[PDB]
């Protein structure tokens, strides 16, 4: 679920940001009420996500992991092609929830493209001033 | 605008463009809903005048219809090219089409000339995804 996924992607956040997660940071963190959070964790508890502070599990930990990668991922792939900074967080939070892992990787061959060789982004900024 | 609502203005584009005509029976048939679905949106489009409720698109209706099947061909464009798996590509669009500003479906577009003028260009990513 894409929410389940922001949930996930934000309480990983937190633990290495802070060293864990209150659910106050939570609510903070994606706009919005306590009583939402509470209700969601109880059900990435029953999912094995996490326990319940709330400690995430082996599983709660790959995806988090995995969840962190996949935006990061998306906001060099934005900044790379020249997507005015401002837009691009609101860009990749839409977007990150509704590509498949293949294009998650595609994606991740094509920034290493770019990445490669400067001269690439050279040419790729001359399309953009035609 | 709404990313349902871009929806069906995409589908009802096409329809019209297709067979000549768009009919509720043949919206609702598309996005697989109800037609009571299908002919509430329709009363909403018809309200923010984008057509006239057989269905008739306004000019502004035609406009942002002709944006909008331009924006699905170049990101199914832009996904075929970077090499994802064909089967994947259509949900893939689906998804992310209502989420992406101008500012990157223009950006994309310079992307996709970029390698459409150079077949070299797609040689070297192809290489890269050898690695
Ligand atoms: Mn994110
Ligand atoms: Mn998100
Ligand atoms: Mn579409
Ligand atoms: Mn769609």
Known sequence: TPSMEDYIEQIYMLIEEKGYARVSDIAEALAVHPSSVTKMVQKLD???????????????????????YRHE?????????????????NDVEGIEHHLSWNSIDRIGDLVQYFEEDDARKKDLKSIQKK
Do not use: H
Request: aromatic share 10%.
């Open 46 to 68: 029953k999912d094995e996500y996490l326990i319940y502070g709330l400690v995430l599990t082996s599983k709660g930990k790959k995806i988090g992991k995995r969840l962190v």
């Open 73 to 89: 991922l998306l906001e060099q792939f934005l900044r790379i092609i020249g997507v005015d900074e401002e837009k691009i967080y």
